Design a protein around this ligand. Structure first.
Ligand SMILES: [C]N([C][C][C]OC1=C2C(=C(Br)[C]=[C]1)[C]([C][N])O[B@]21O[C]2[C]([C]OP([O])([O])=O)O[C](N3[C]=NC4=C([N])N=[C]N=C43)[C]2O1)[C]C1=[C][C]=[C][C]=[C]1
Length: 168
């Protein structure tokens, strides 16, 4: 609709992953990264046998994915996030790649529950016509800020480091 594009460093390689989000302020609650089945990164960084795993389609309506074997470095935390090929990510929409926040997104929770991924809460429950007064927590420099202030500060920090930009 109107979001931000974020670059993630792929661990042990000189390659990057661009993801699109409409909730950049929930970045400290990221558990995984997921790309579409038809994403270029599948043909570039993975074996041809990945198509055999993909066709095994079996669990429809259920959020399923395959761990690629690669991790991405979190931009602000000393930690890595696993990278998946997921059935619920659409290639034709934006970058065909997402970051997952299971504590505040139903689709991300269903995926994390299946693959035992961590659940990290970041919003404590209370464009310019209204202000969302829910407060950020577990989010380093975003702590204590309302959701509205946090959306602004995270974008300034991503732009300041050359790893994020506004995307219409
Ligand atoms: C879940 N819904 C959206 C609802 C709003 O998205 C939410 C998003 C977060 C949170 Br926290 C809460 C809601 C965070 C963490 N996941 O990021 B979020 O913002 C993006 C958000 C942007 O979509 P929109 O419609 O709001 O403009 O959808 C996710 N996304 C992006 N590209 C994607 C892609 N190719 N295939 C799938 N999903 C993608 C991203 O998920 C996904 C959805 C289902 C089908 C087509 C397109 C989007």
């Amino acid at each position: 609709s109107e979001g931000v594009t974020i670059e993630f460093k792929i661990v042990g390689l000189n390659k990057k992953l661009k993801v699109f989000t409409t909730c950049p302020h929930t970045l400290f609650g990221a558990s995984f990264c997921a790309v579409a089945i038809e994403h270029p990164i599948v043909q570039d960084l993975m074996s041809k046998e990945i198509q055999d795993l993909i066709s095994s389609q079996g669990k429809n309506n259920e959020k399923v994915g395959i761990y690629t074997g690669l991790n991405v470095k979190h931009p602000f935390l000393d930690k890595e996030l696993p990278l998946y090929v997921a059935n619920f990510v659409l290639m034709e929409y934006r970058e065909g790649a997402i970051f997952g926040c299971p504590a505040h997104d139903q689709r991300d929770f269903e995926f994390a529950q299946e693959y035992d991924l961590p659940i990290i809460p970041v919003i404590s429950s209370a464009i310019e016509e209204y202000t969302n007064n829910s407060i950020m927590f577990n989010s380093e420099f975003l702590n204590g800020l309302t959701v509205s202030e946090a959306r602004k500060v995270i974008v300034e920090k991503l732009e300041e480091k050359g790893i994020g930009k506004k995307t219409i």
